[PDB]
């Protein structure tokens, strides 16, 4: 008898595994706080979304379309579609890596096989409903057992872990990139559009269960970060271990669990990865359907939407795998998480605005403290994103670009795009678009 949840499954995508492995292998227990803040954020926002439904009976998508003009709503839909595609790129890459580990076929073979097997997975999901729940619970239990055993064998320094987890510090540009990647992979803005739908059907105990699921997911994520950080860094390593830790794709993870599985970790880890990727795709299909059916009301079959998303995701993932090997796929997973974090504000600002706005939410209002905390966190996230973007662009421009004829054009284009992004965020933030009500 286990009252499991699907939120932790969405928090254990291959994107989360890749971002956690990178954070642990590049900054030891330095970005643990991002996992603590992100989760604390990711839960809080979700709560608001759920509460919105209970107070309105309509998804965030319907309200966003109703209270905004045609062009703003179209741009929001484009942002949501980009968010779903960026989420679905890691699933394809995760499953391709699982196939590479298991059947010893190249990564592009994995991506092609995942495109072929999306239909079979959809059919299986249609056939069984509790079997999927048991599969996700068993996968979560396997990941928890494997990583907790690995952690116990490792025995890291508790003082250093606490100092890294409760003392935020983005010590370096690379740390900023990995912190943004972790925020993207944990916050996952598109899920808001999905989560509201989960309450369209019709809570201290429900909140307690959600908090338990989130605590399990956060414990697993912290365990992955700590295990990667301790094993990759340690004090003395074999040259092979250092070379594997340098890149550390999603297919070199088996090196992590070798202590607690004994050279048999390849099969178990590949199975865990494949199950996690497939389950994340299953969950995100509903989110894509809800986005499509809310932002424009254009009804689309779930299987058709899933096929379109998987093809659009395979295009770039397959191109990257062909041009670059597993390291390229890892870079693409991190980039997809970064894009998710970057475009989270567009799907988060309307939620907070509608929660505050008494007109749309009616007499019922969310707790002022939670709304203020969410607003402050969202503003901090936007500022960190903009600072990292300006940082990387400036460093590229100052000395990394040789030509000068196109330097002015590139600078103008980048400044125009950044100004448009900031102007859109400011329009959505310090401006009221309220021409409706409950």
């Amino acid at each position, epitope marked *: 008898v286990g009252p499991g949840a699907l939120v932790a499954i969405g928090f254990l995508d291959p994107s989360n595994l890749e971002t956690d492995m990178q954070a642990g*292998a*590049d*900054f*030891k227990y*330095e970005l643990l706080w991002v996992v603590l803040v992100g989760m604390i954020f990711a839960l809080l926002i979700q709560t608001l979304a759920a509460n919105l439904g209970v107070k309105t009976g309509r998804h965030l998508a319907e309200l966003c379309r109703e209270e905004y003009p045609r062009y703003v709503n179209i741009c929001l839909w484009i942002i949501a579609e980009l968010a779903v595609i960026s989420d679905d790129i890691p699933e394809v890459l995760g499953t391709a890596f699982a196939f590479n580990i298991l059947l010893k076929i190249p990564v592009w073979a994995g991506v092609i096989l995942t495109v072929f097997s999306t239909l079979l997975l959809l059919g299986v999901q249609r056939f069984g409903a509790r079997k999927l729940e048991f599969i996700i619970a068993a996968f979560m239990f396997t990941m928890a057992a494997c990583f907790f055993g690995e952690l116990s064998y490792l025995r890291p320094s508790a003082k250093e872990v606490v100092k890294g987890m409760f003392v935020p*510090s*983005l*010590q*370096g*540009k*690379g*740390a900023a990139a990995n912190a943004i990647a972790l925020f993207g992979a944990i916050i996952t803005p598109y899920n808001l559009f999905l989560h509201s739908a989960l309450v369209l059907s019709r809570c201290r105990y429900f909140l307690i269960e959600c908090s338990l699921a989130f605590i399990v997911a956060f414990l697993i994520n912290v365990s992955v970060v700590v295990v990667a950080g301790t094993i*990759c*860094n340690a*004090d003395n*390593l074999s040259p092979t271990d*250092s*070379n594997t*830790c*340098s890149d550390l794709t999603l297919q070199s993870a088996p090196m992590l669990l070798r202590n607690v599985l004994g050279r048999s970790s390849s099969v178990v880890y590949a199975v865990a990865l494949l199950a996690s990727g497939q389950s994340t795709t299953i969950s995100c299909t509903f989110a894509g359907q809800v986005i499509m059916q809310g932002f424009l009301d254009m009804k689309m079959k779930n299987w058709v939407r899933n096929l379109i998303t998987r093809v659009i995701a395979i295009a770039p993932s397959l191109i990257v795998s062909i041009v670059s090997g597993p390291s390229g796929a890892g870079k693409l997973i991190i980039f997809s998480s970064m894009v998710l974090s970057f475009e989270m504000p567009f799907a988060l600002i309307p939620l907070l605005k509608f929660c505050n706005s008494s007109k749309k939410v009616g007499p019922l209002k969310e707790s002022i403290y939670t709304v203020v905390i969410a607003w402050i966190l969202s503003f901090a996230l936007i500022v960190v994103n903009t600072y990292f973007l300006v*940082w990387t662009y400036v*460093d590229w421009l*100052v*000395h*990394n670009h040789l030509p000068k004829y196109a330097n002015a054009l590139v600078s103008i284009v980048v400044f125009a795009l950044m100004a448009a992004y900031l102007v859109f965020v400011v329009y959505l933030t310090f401006r009221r678009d309220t021409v409706s009500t409950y």
Partner: nanobody
Amino acid sequence: QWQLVESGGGLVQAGGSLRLSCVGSGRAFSSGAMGWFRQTPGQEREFVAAISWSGGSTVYAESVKGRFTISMDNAKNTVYLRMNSLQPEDTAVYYCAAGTSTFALRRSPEYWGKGTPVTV
């Protein structure tokens, strides 16, 4: 041009206090980590120190800790290593190195340097 150029060290007697400066240009190194490595006449390269852009991240080598103070000037994009209480065991060629974080530089430095000999 893009390069890293260690400068200093020379030769000292003991408690050398030698203050080695690594200057990097052409790739904007002072955003991840800018650390050092050492290699004795016959041996493999070893970690000596590192520092991140934030300023407090210095991770040292258990062989030498509390004697080397590493500071980073971001604006000039330079990494300074102060060696105090020097000893014969530290005789070696020192290589500046730059990475993507103060721990990745611990293992695989993206960019290396020619290095300078420090003899006691």
